[PDB]
Amino acid sequence: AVPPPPVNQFLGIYDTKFPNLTKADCLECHVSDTVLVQQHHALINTVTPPASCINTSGTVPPTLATGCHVMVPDGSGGFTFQDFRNCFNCHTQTPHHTSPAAVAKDCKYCHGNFIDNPLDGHYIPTYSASSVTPMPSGRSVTATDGNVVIVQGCEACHQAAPNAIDPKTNTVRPIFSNQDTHHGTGITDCNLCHNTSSNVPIRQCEVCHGVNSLHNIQKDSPNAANLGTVKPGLEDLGWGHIGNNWDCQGCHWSWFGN
């Protein structure tokens, strides 16, 4: 839980925050309200008795069986409408991960090629080796500058910086560690992440974090005489997984002695 000497890059797909900490700017993947209107009202024709245009039950999750629109009273009556421009008045949760996809475990669809589908049949390593092997959360060792630092694992650099971020959007989006961005999705299938095969700490994650998908996650170089087609060697320290030998060492070896 300590970023590279370059601050933990976030040119990846999703900022690691819980869904609730996303802004009302879901507009990039849900293009605009002008299409969202029909994207919602198309659902009224789904049921033969149409979906109630008004939400009289008041349940914060508006099941289409109930309604969406809520009419809140005002001074001297004045029934008004709470809101439908912002998205966090009715969804207010993880809307995805309950969809049809992420129920047949088709997580790769809509999560990018960063991940392999947990049922894709990709290559998982069969050998029971442990000499140079990465572990979830890694382990800690004393660095050359005294500070106890975690090495040989995903938590060696995937870290929770909650305070100072400056992503492209240039707001504050608090980064979160693992075991809350994966549990914050609200899935309850422990067979997926925490099965009990092989008694190797990383072989559970190897499903949908496979070898051929983990050794491709690399962003562009600032100055490495390539400026394109990132070579797996000869790159900056951080900026991905297969960039510089420092990365391979941080996830595979100790990189701080032992």
Shortest distance (Å) from residue 120 CB to ligand HEC: 15
The reply to whether 122 sits in an annotated binding site is no
- Give the residue carrying structure tokens 């190797």: 200
In order, the DSSP letters of 184-210 are TT----HHHHS--STT-TTTTTTTTS-
Residue in 35, 30, 64, 69 with CA at minimum distance from that of residue 50:
64
Instruction: Please tell me the distance from the alpha carbon of residue 71 to that of residue 83, in angstroms, as a whole number.
Output: 9
Q: How many helices (H) and strands (E) does the chain have?
A: 4, 4
What is the CA 118 to chain-centroid distance, rounded? 16
The reply to whether 69 sits in an annotated binding site is yes
| First-residue to last-residue Cα distance in the chain | 18
CB 114 within 8 A of CB 13: yes
CB 124 within 8 A of CB 206: yes
The reply to whether 127 sits in an annotated binding site is yes
Q: Which residues bind its own copies (CB under 8 A)?
A: 34, 37-38, 41, 44-45, 50, 52-56, 67, 71, 77-81, 127, 129, 131-132, 212, 215-216, 231-234, 242, 245, 248-249, 252-253, 255, 258
Task: Select 51 or 193, whichever has its Cβ closest to its own copies.
Answer: 51
Shortest distance (Å) from residue 121 CB to ligand HEC: 15
Shortest distance (Å) from residue 146 CB to ligand HEC: 21
The reply to whether 142 sits in an annotated binding site is no
What is the CA 64 to chain-centroid distance, rounded? 27
What are the binding residues? 11-12, 14, 26, 29-30, 40-41, 53, 68-69, 85, 87, 90-91, 94, 96-97, 107, 110-111, 123, 127, 154, 157-158, 181-183, 190, 193-194, 203, 205, 208-209, 215, 241, 251-252
Q: Residues at the annotated binding site for heme c?
A: 11-12, 14, 26, 29-30, 40-41, 53, 68-69, 85, 87, 90-91, 94, 96-97, 107, 110-111, 123, 127, 154, 157-158, 181-183, 190, 193-194, 203, 205, 208-209, 215, 241, 251-252
